[PDB]
Design a protein around this ligand. Sequence first.
Ligand SMILES: Cc1cn([C@H]2C[C@H](O)[C@@H](COP(=O)(O)OP(=O)(O)OP(=O)(O)O)O2)c(=O)[nH]c1=O
Ligand SMILES: Cc1cn([C@H]2C[C@H](O)[C@@H](COP(=O)(O)OP(=O)(O)OP(=O)(O)O)O2)c(=O)[nH]c1=O
Ligand SMILES: Cc1cn([C@H]2C[C@H](O)[C@@H](COP(=O)(O)OP(=O)(O)OP(=O)(O)O)O2)c(=O)[nH]c1=O
Ligand SMILES: Cc1cn([C@H]2C[C@H](O)[C@@H](COP(=O)(O)OP(=O)(O)OP(=O)(O)O)O2)c(=O)[nH]c1=O
Ligand SMILES: Cc1cn([C@H]2C[C@H](O)[C@@H](COP(=O)(O)OP(=O)(O)OP(=O)(O)O)O2)c(=O)[nH]c1=O
Ligand SMILES: Cc1cn([C@H]2C[C@H](O)[C@@H](COP(=O)(O)OP(=O)(O)OP(=O)(O)O)O2)c(=O)[nH]c1=O
Lengths: 245, 245, 245, 245, 245, 245
Amino acid sequence: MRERIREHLSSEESVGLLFSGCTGINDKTLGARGGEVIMVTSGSGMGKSTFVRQQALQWGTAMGKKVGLAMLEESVEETAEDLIGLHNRVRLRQSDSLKREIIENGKFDQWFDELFGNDTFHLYDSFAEAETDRLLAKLAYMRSGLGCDVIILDHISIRKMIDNLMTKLKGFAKSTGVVLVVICHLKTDLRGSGALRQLSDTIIALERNQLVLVRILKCRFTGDTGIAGYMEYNKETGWLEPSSY
Amino acid sequence: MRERIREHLSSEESVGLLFSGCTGINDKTLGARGGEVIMVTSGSGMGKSTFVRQQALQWGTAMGKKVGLAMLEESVEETAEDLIGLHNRVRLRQSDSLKREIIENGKFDQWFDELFGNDTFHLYDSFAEAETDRLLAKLAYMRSGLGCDVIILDHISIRKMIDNLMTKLKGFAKSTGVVLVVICHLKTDLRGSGALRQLSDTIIALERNQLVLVRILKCRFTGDTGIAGYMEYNKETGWLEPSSY
Amino acid sequence: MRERIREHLSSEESVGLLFSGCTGINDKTLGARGGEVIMVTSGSGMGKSTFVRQQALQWGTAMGKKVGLAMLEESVEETAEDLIGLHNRVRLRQSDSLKREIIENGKFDQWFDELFGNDTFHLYDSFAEAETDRLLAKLAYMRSGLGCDVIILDHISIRKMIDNLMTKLKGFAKSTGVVLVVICHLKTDLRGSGALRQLSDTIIALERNQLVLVRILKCRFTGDTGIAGYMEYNKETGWLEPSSY
Amino acid sequence: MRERIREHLSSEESVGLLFSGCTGINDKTLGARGGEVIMVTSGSGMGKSTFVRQQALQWGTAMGKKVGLAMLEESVEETAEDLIGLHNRVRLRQSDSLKREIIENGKFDQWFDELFGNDTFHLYDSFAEAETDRLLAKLAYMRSGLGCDVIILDHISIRKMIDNLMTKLKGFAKSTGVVLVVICHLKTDLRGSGALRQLSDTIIALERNQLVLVRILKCRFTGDTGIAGYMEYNKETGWLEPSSY
Amino acid sequence: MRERIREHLSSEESVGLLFSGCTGINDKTLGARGGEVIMVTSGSGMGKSTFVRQQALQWGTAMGKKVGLAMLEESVEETAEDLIGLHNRVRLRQSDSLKREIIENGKFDQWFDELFGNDTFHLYDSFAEAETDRLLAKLAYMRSGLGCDVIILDHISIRKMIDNLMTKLKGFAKSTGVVLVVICHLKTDLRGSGALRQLSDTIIALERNQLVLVRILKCRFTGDTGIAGYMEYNKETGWLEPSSY
Amino acid sequence: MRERIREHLSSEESVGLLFSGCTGINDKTLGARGGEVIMVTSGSGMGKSTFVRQQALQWGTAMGKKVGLAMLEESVEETAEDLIGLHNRVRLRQSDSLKREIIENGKFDQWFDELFGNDTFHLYDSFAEAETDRLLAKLAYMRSGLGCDVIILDHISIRKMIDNLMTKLKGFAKSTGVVLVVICHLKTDLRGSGALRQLSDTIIALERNQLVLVRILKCRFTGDTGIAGYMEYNKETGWLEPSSY
Ligand SMILES: Cc1cn([C@H]2C[C@H](O)[C@@H](COP(=O)(O)OP(=O)(O)OP(=O)(O)O)O2)c(=O)[nH]c1=O
Ligand SMILES: Cc1cn([C@H]2C[C@H](O)[C@@H](COP(=O)(O)OP(=O)(O)OP(=O)(O)O)O2)c(=O)[nH]c1=O
Ligand SMILES: Cc1cn([C@H]2C[C@H](O)[C@@H](COP(=O)(O)OP(=O)(O)OP(=O)(O)O)O2)c(=O)[nH]c1=O
Ligand SMILES: Cc1cn([C@H]2C[C@H](O)[C@@H](COP(=O)(O)OP(=O)(O)OP(=O)(O)O)O2)c(=O)[nH]c1=O
Ligand SMILES: Cc1cn([C@H]2C[C@H](O)[C@@H](COP(=O)(O)OP(=O)(O)OP(=O)(O)O)O2)c(=O)[nH]c1=O
Ligand SMILES: Cc1cn([C@H]2C[C@H](O)[C@@H](COP(=O)(O)OP(=O)(O)OP(=O)(O)O)O2)c(=O)[nH]c1=O
């Protein structure tokens, strides 16, 4: 047992992929570990995607990880546009001028390669179809075929479709060891559903004004729950910034 | 993806129909885009119609757009009287004298043609009936038949009638691409209802003394919320003017 | 529409029954129109009845209108005594001498006929009962049977009794087209209640020393709010006079 | 109505019990009428009791009225001593000599009968208890049993005790028609309380040096407010005298 | 009978193994007696294992008892890691640093012997198989072969598998006299099942925030039910502490 | 018939052995009559034995009756321990201290004689065997040989064993005239079985929290059914007390 415990002790990965922008989030969660399902939820337009996109950007950019992004709702161009702006600390969607200037400028192309030139980000859309298996098959490919370290499922809104999917999702993450982050629409802990709350390893909720409050609704590994801290959205750069609240 | 993003970038219309009279409204919203539902709300007699009528006037007059106006509460003559006065910076309803003077003067007729002579404004009333489909059918006609760029629904007060209508309205706007502005009576964000808040793309609220404060309660496209600025109602011209508050 | 607007323009009555004694009141309200409910409120003993009685006197006396007066609190003799004095610029209630002198003098009778001789004023009391319908039935009779142009309800103090009554009152005024002035006891805009503020077309508030300030809390038709002006109560004649404040 | 108004006119009592010592008080109030509650207030030691006692003396002495005096704070002997001195234009309480001289002199007894010999004054004390009903029952007896025309409640200082009492007091005065004068301690109009200000028909306030200023804070019947005049306290006779201020 | 009762009285063990960390738990239960089945239940991640592990630690450490721990879900290394940390008031699983530091430090080995050096704790895993008898045979061995005073079954979630097992478990405890604590997952009293509630001698439920509330759902021996008290989880030491709620 | 009815009237015993601790139980049942079978049922650990033991104590102690107690489940020492504690308003089983203190104290012996010194209570156990006749023979002996007035059968849980036994029990009670109280385990009226419900003359059910509610499910003699009242268990004395629910 002794030797058995020892190697067990020296082989265990407690700290996963560290989160960014929110001082305290890593304290209460110790980052994202492989095989876990992170659920990021909140009200519509409350900043779910931004937050996740930001994590994706850092992970694939600074942590040198391969990030797959599966979009159920929006298109790849939309997602790409968002990452490019984010990466360049500008909001392409808000500036008809910038979009136009950047294309003739040659900065678009320069920006495109400086981000997707490498084999780091894998964006997939067209899952418009309500079939889970079709979805799991693509996810499994992103993992195995493209070697994605992290897979972001954007998004899901609260039957078996969700129940069974959540159970399939959790199964896929646990067996492969990839980090699966799922974005779910909440229209508190109960605000979700059975499997949603149950299968998810860590649940993060963003709250706003009615500055974003980052609440850790659940973290199996750590058990440390409560509010991790606050973030301040930069309307000019589109980045969620750490706050002094 | 590259070419896919590029054309996507160069084909996207971020800035819609610009609003008028309130310095800052366009900052936080970037105007009214086609396919979106703009909700303008506030207390009764707080200036909702005036504000909307003003936007209508400029859109159809200066922006060279076709504006359809569907009145649920008041008559076409009433609406026409309002636009004519507005257009002529006078308040016809307040002056028994002006009304009388303008008719024999010949200015009425001159005013009438100089405004409705063209095929720009389309006023429709008699929707007194509480039937949605009867209403949607007329709206669809204003869009297709009369080629209206903007449709103003005046008005609605806070069931399914509103819920289902809001969902029908939003469906009609999104599929056709017309700009649908709806005026709703509020007797804050919650001050409305589910679909009311949910389906509406941009929600504008006017506040007064208890000078009008223009608050942007919600803007999906931009996410930029808060107070856009102030306006000053001209009791002599009936126009809401930009303020130096 | 053109012809439709025209006749609409030449048929609309913007200026109603003009008020008296307060320079500016007509500016911000354009008088009292038929079908509207005018609410006159203020603190107890602040001059509500006097003000209304004065308007009644002029309307029925100079404007050649038929005025019905329904008193909930006081008796007809009391009301008559007040009008007679007012009409004769003397305060009967304050002078035991005058009352006595006028009766033997023969001036009482001369005063009585010179005021009520004609079919212009209709005073009704004994509504001591808290039943609305009993009240509405009498009002409707004053309108139809006695052809009253203006009906003054004196008085009401701030449930459904008031809520439902206000809604019944407003219904009666709107459908008949009579001018209904209601006197309400306030123990600002909120100082009242839902229907009270809501159904009332124009709300006038009198303010005193803690010379009477005439504040226009609300005017649907005009929207012109604020203080209309000042009046000076004549302790010798009992008349509220226009001031030079 | 005519005959109805006439008799109404010839039966109405405008002028009540006239006040004394202050030239102008009767002008702005027309005296004390039966069924009304007169409130006399001011700072402690400002001359409230003296003023009231003086009115009592004249009413019961010259006006040939029956005056009941209910003392909550002091004793009957104290009150009697005060009236006797007042009546004899001397201050018994200030002169150990006079008190002693008057008793052996035989003037005490002569003074006692010449004042209380008759059935005009009714002094009652021992209401030390904070029970209203116990108090109302005594008051009602003074009215009915002893036929008191005027009842003076001395005193009250500013809950429901006061609120409910004021409402009970006003009820008792209105239904019986007695004149009820209440002395209240003020530690302006607001200086009192709800019912205090509300139920009281006439409110008199005495002001001094920081010669007594007599201010009429409120008079329902007349509406005539403001300062009625000035009085000059005679430190030798204890009488408040009319002034030439 | 007398002598029969006497010795009966002087031979009966009312107070069993005292619990720790929760002031009041022993009051309502009088500890854990041999032959009884203690059921500790609550929601997943609510602190069941910690609580039980803590009791185990004290029993085997301070009470000088032999504690067998049978883990159905997790491994021995995991369990050992937990006890070692607990014993050393540190959370090994949360600190990649501590784990690493402790191994080279030599503190691991020192910690290992200072806890398992003796023959006090007996950890057994690999019961992954759903066979009861295979399970009962191991338990019986832990009792007889290893002389375990207390056996902790971790864990069971709510057929006959549970029904029959619960009946086998209770049979084993009653006949041997060992103290059997079973941890069951609850997804109130009914929240369990027939045998679960029936065979269990004492049922403890932990409740948290939607500080841990310790509720005694059932205690045959004592009958004393209700909430025993509160505990406060120390996120730094991993120990559940007694509270001042 | 007359004389026949008369003596019949004057010889009939309507009121039996009165129950204790529950205000109302005697109202709806009129006590326990000889020849009747009282069934006391409820959930396990719901207080059946306590309740019955209490009745036994009072009957044999205060009513001067001879009470036989036949225990099927537990031993005589256990039963004796319970009665002694009950009799001394202490819970011997819960206090290892008291048990020990009382024995050396000499209070045990004093307690033993002061309760069983006399020939009032007859406790019999060892009926562990499932034979009815063996059981009936002992019961018959307790009646005839020991002259027991009341016999308590503790206990029975819900075939013919119960059916035939219930029929034998009822036969024994009816023919001898003893009062037979039987305690049955219920795992409403139907909650039992044929003979159980049928042969039993009076059925009492205790209900608790999911303070004990005493429900009279059946009373042949009286027919008066429903809830008799409430009792409050004293965790310190072990006595069920009458409540103020
Ligand atoms: C957090 C935040 C978001 N936003 C904007 C950016 C986007 O245009 C918009 C939505 O942000 P998202 O990140 O898309 O929010 P969401 O993912 O919760 O929304 P949905 O229900 O649509 O999936 O709001 C702000 O303008 N300010 C802010 O502080
Ligand atoms: C904003 C404003 C309005 N108004 C007047 C103009 C109109 O006669 C009246 C109502 O303005 P509207 O524009 O009709 O206000 P609304 O649409 O919120 O009202 P409703 O509940 O009746 O639909 O108020 C002013 O007088 N001053 C002002 O500053
Ligand atoms: C305005 C005014 C009123 N008054 C007097 C006239 C009346 O006797 C008395 C009340 O005037 P009212 O016109 O009766 O005042 P009101 O209608 O607000 O009162 P209520 O609560 O009793 O219904 O006040 C003055 O003496 N001076 C003034 O300046
Ligand atoms: C008015 C006045 C009163 N006084 C004296 C007479 C009395 O001894 C004393 C109080 O007069 P009071 O009439 O008792 O005054 P008050 O009723 O307001 O007082 P309290 O709070 O005690 O009830 O003051 C003067 O000496 N000079 C004056 O000018
Ligand atoms: C009670 C408590 C537990 N925890 C953590 C410690 C662990 O990592 C995690 C689970 O505690 P456990 O003791 O494992 O809870 P459990 O046994 O009820 O759970 P399961 O369903 O998984 O068998 O929660 C806290 O972080 N804070 C607390 O206050
Ligand atoms: C009624 C009651 C019982 N008890 C306890 C006393 C005993 O130790 C235990 C059982 O009471 P019993 O009187 O034995 O209950 P029962 O006869 O229905 O049970 P069984 O199925 O075991 O035959 O419960 C309380 O602690 N509180 C109470 O309020």
